[PDB]
Amino acid sequence: RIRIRLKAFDHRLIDQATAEIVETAKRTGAQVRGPIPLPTRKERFTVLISPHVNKDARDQYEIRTHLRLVDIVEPTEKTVDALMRLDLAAGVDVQISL
Amino acid sequence: RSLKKGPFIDLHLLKKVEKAVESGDKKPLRTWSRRSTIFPNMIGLTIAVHNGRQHVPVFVTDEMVGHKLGEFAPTRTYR
Amino acid sequence: AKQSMKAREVKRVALADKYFAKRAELKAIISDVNAASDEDRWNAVLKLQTLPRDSSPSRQRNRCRQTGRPHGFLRKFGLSRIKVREAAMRGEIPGLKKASW
Amino acid sequence: NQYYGTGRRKSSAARVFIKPGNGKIVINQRSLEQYFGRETARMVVRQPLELVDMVEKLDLYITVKGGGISGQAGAIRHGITRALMEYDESLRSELRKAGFVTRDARQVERKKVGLRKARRRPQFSKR
Amino acid sequence: ARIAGINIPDHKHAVIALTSIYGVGKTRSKAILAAAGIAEDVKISELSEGQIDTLRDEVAKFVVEGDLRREISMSIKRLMDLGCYRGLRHRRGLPVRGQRTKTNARTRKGPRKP
Amino acid sequence: PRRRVIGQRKILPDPKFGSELLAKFVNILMVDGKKSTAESIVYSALETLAQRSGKSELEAFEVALENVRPTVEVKSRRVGGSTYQVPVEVRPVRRNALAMRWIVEAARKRGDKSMALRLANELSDAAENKGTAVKKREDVHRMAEANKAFA
RNA sequence: AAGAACCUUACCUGGUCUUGACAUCCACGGAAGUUUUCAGAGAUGAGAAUGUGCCUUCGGGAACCGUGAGACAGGUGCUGC
RNA sequence: CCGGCCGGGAACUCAAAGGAGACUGCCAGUGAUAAACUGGAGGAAGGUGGGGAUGACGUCAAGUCAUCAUGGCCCUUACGACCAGGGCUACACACGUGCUACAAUGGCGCAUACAAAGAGAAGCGACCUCGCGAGAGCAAGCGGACCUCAUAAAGUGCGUCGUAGUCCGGAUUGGAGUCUGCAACUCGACUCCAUGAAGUCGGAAUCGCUAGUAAUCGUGGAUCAGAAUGCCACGGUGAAUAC
């Protein structure tokens, strides 16, 4: 029922964010589905490292956006509000849909 | 080739053209709008189109209708 | 970097968002294939010169926000390539590290 | 009953279920002769099936996605060789002395910056 | 096989033959044959004269060698008479559609003799 | 190279009856990397030559090749001064490959109708030793046998 | 230069502006803002209707706009020796 | 209504994490019983497995004070500032980098099958109607493993073309039309109607590549209102030679 989709940049932060947001909702709101992988979006960019000639020299950067679905099944009272006003462990865009 | 709906003209150009037409023959009208087309009602005017540094007067003709004014203002002088 | 050009560009942005995006119906709705095929659309295109040569979105060059550079611009970060590299290597842009694959 | 091999070769990915019965090959709701059996490399899947015959032992329900004709066919070959596990190394010792077990990744190299197709420099000239 | 002016074609299909006429190419030839009821696989060696007559009375609807040539000449002459940018380029022997005259534009300019 | 003493690669056997030499022949027929079409042309010419001469696909090729198989080639090996040619025996792995290369080069020209017909006619001609690949072999043997003084 | 129709533009012709288009100080007068007409290539000049709060030291304030001088601003002007 | 469409599962593909493994690990020979080389067994992978980022003290008194900061020289009623038009696209010529080809392992018409990686909200834009067409009108889904971009092409079969400057080639040209934009003459792209050129494999000279690399075929993205044969990236077929 409750579609929780969370995306961030650093995996070794988003993973534990998901762990805490899942155990703070399964210890009292159990029957959850867990951290679905939701493959990463890789936004790449290729710029020139020089302000002038020597175009052949370029730098290649990228930003990874890791996504995860929790997918809670039942809209429980131990869940609906226990999801709210608990927005710590920042750096992660979380979206809850009914 | 473009602008399927209606020719294009400037407000100043159209107003001055209608004024001079309802007035009669007048001195060459200094224009700067080469982007504008040519109406059938402007035949006879000696308007002077800007070429970049001067104004070349052109005598509007019945054939010089579908084209624009810039088609008759050679800008780049070669030799 | 030609503060004159930068002030010119911010003036363009202000005047454009002020006039267009609010009165665009004069060229988007009236110039339609409908009963407006008569002098209505002619007067519509006539008044389309009411607004100055500016005010259009195509005259927006989208220069950089730190320097004001016209070339090498990225719509994602709003900066030129030089400054985006500098900031990425200093650690200002999140998630943006050197790509290798 | 039914054994499984995965298989993958050059951006391909297969799923080869192997069952004792007829000698037919049903691949993606299409038979082997009409899938790629009309083009060249017609027996790149039947190559590892003469050292151990297939005509009247077992059939294969095959799926494959990604890559091209030869890529998917090599993926099918590797999936068959990996699914031949109910007939384990007792036969792989012979299957391997002719190939058919080397993954052979050799993926396409990434295009390099400044180059054209990862090896072709942009036509150097002195003056 | 004495259709419009030329069109003398031997051992060529109907459309590949009609492409010999200055004024009808491929799509126009296929349209001619579709309006005449002729197939695009038969040759002039097999097509009967009762159908050469249909070819005649059909291709006459479109502009032909002489009419097309004189129309083109009159358009070019009208441009050179108005003296627009296009007429100036026509008289100077240079491309009209804004092609590159610095390095390219050798066909309309002439062979690279000098 | 200079340090790498690596050897040759192990090509894939032929999808028809098992054979490596005609597989290498097919590999040297291919332009733009189109191998299916090259195999089709090779099979067409092989069938056209087998049906015309009476022999089969694998035996027919062998007779033709040996007629264009060179003996010695000349190559420049200057030794402190003059730059002269040195006729020498070529390895067999290069000899057969060069024979097939000359075959395909002669077939590239002499356009009869199609590539398969070209190559079948060239193979038939090398069978009786009156084609163009055999003419190239004889040109090489004439370059040799004349400058044999350098050894 | 990861992209010249205008724009971008740093060049030329032509018309203009000048402590100035962009930034800070003083004093004076006006809420800001909004609609609209005339002449013009437009920049611009001349206008016509509207609108008057956020707190009262309440000789007005916190913004915005019109002008005068001086400190200044501006320069893709030169010097990568 | 055989569309995984629906129940049903976490076996399988894919998917984002944490680990294992590949590290000269063992054996035979050679080598000064050392380092190391060769060969072999297991193993997907043998010896830095494949690829990338990572660029040593310094040289060229190299390029950029036009991306940006700054010493000093100068204008500072101007070399500063605003605007209409033009140019940066000009052409007797020379050069560099690529595309298109020069054709029959191929051009054309038809029926068919197999990808990866990515973009998307004052944008991508299903479906339906109109035109040969570029596109237009109504208008769902999507800030996204669902919606769109988006039909992958070479390839396979059929019929034609008989080696001709030819149906290869598409340059240039006149009218008309579609799309972005206030406006497409100078100076955009696109489809159709007519035209069809030079070009039949290229002199001296010269460049790239030793593997999935070359060669060849197609797809996406940044720039962008629109505007690439360029740049970056992805994927299909896939060689020869290294004495």
Swiss-Prot record, chain F:
<dbReference type="GO" id="GO:0000028">
    <property type="term" value="P:ribosomal small subunit assembly"/>
</dbReference>
<comment type="subunit">
    <text>Part of the 30S ribosomal subunit. Contacts proteins S9 and S11. Cross-links to IF3 and the P and E site tRNAs.</text>
</comment>
<dbReference type="GO" id="GO:0017148">
    <property type="term" value="P:negative regulation of translation"/>
</dbReference>
<dbReference type="GO" id="GO:0002181">
    <property type="term" value="P:cytoplasmic translation"/>
</dbReference>
<dbReference type="GO" id="GO:0016020">
    <property type="term" value="C:membrane"/>
</dbReference>
<keyword id="KW-0687">Ribonucleoprotein</keyword>
<dbReference type="GO" id="GO:0003729">
    <property type="term" value="F:mRNA binding"/>
</dbReference>
<dbReference type="GO" id="GO:0005737">
    <property type="term" value="C:cytoplasm"/>
</dbReference>
<dbReference type="GO" id="GO:0019843">
    <property type="term" value="F:rRNA binding"/>
</dbReference>
<dbReference type="GO" id="GO:0000049">
    <property type="term" value="F:tRNA binding"/>
</dbReference>
<protein>
    <recommendedName>
        <fullName>Small ribosomal subunit protein uS7</fullName>
    </recommendedName>
</protein>
<comment type="function">
    <text>One of the primary rRNA binding proteins, it binds directly to 16S rRNA where it nucleates assembly of the head domain of the 30S subunit. Is located at the subunit interface close to the decoding center, where it has been shown to contact mRNA. Has been shown to contact tRNA in both the P and E sites; it probably blocks exit of the E site tRNA.</text>
</comment>
<dbReference type="GO" id="GO:0005829">
    <property type="term" value="C:cytosol"/>
</dbReference>
<comment type="similarity">
    <text>Belongs to the universal ribosomal protein uS7 family.</text>
</comment>
<dbReference type="GO" id="GO:0003735">
    <property type="term" value="F:structural constituent of ribosome"/>
</dbReference>
<keyword id="KW-0694">RNA-binding</keyword>
<comment type="function">
    <text>Protein S7 is also a translational repressor protein; it regulates the expression of the str operon members to different degrees by binding to its mRNA.</text>
</comment>
<dbReference type="GO" id="GO:0005840">
    <property type="term" value="C:ribosome"/>
</dbReference>
<dbReference type="GO" id="GO:0022627">
    <property type="term" value="C:cytosolic small ribosomal subunit"/>
</dbReference>
<keyword id="KW-0820">tRNA-binding</keyword>
<dbReference type="GO" id="GO:0006412">
    <property type="term" value="P:translation"/>
</dbReference>
<keyword id="KW-0699">rRNA-binding</keyword>
<keyword id="KW-0689">Ribosomal protein</keyword>
